[PDB]
Symmetry: C2
Subunit: 105 residues, 2 copies
């Protein structure tokens, strides 16, 4: 259940289905991985980083992403840019779903 080139996935908000939907990869290839992370309200991910640059898009709900020098409160439609190796943590304020795109080096 992964997209190949030319294929499509819907990242619309899950809404009432959020609580029944696990996080899943849309696709993973040599240079890129795209995943939908589903976080229930309160879920935390400790400080960490990835070697390539990445983007986190808040599809619904509210999530706090701690970064060097700030705590970014993302709401629906917010797209956060993380440079290569930029440390960050995640705190789901509400039930939320995130589209996470990671460049692999």
């Amino acid at each position: 259940p992964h997209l190949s080139s030319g294929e499509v996935a819907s990242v619309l908000p899950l809404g009432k289905q959020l609580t029944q939907t696990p996080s899943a990869a849309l696709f993973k290839e040599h240079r890129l991985e795209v995943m939908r992370m589903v976080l229930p309200a309160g879920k935390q991910v400790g400080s960490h980083s990835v070697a390539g640059p990445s983007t986190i898009q808040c599809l619904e709900g509210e999530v706090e992403i701690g970064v060097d020098g700030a705590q970014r409160r993302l709401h629906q439609g917010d797209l956060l840019y993380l440079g290569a190796g930029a440390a960050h943590d995640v705190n789901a304020i509400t039930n939320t779903s995130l589209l996470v795109t990671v460049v692999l080096v």
Copy 2:
């Protein structure tokens, strides 16, 4: 004012402000470029390819993206994966905005 690491841009639907908003890069860095393409209804981009893989997310409206072996009709929330060097064309069905993420090789 492109995003630096840890910064946020809204990719919410433009709605009534769509036809007044030009396409713009959210950021451009060594390994990754993220742009919002704003296409008025009927606008076409001819068949072309980029060297790295990419994703095209339909933020609002409807767009037809031609790919090898198919014509994908994307609606809001649809995310298309394009492999490295995958030829594609774009036809805005309605006024639409697209989040385009491109891995740079």
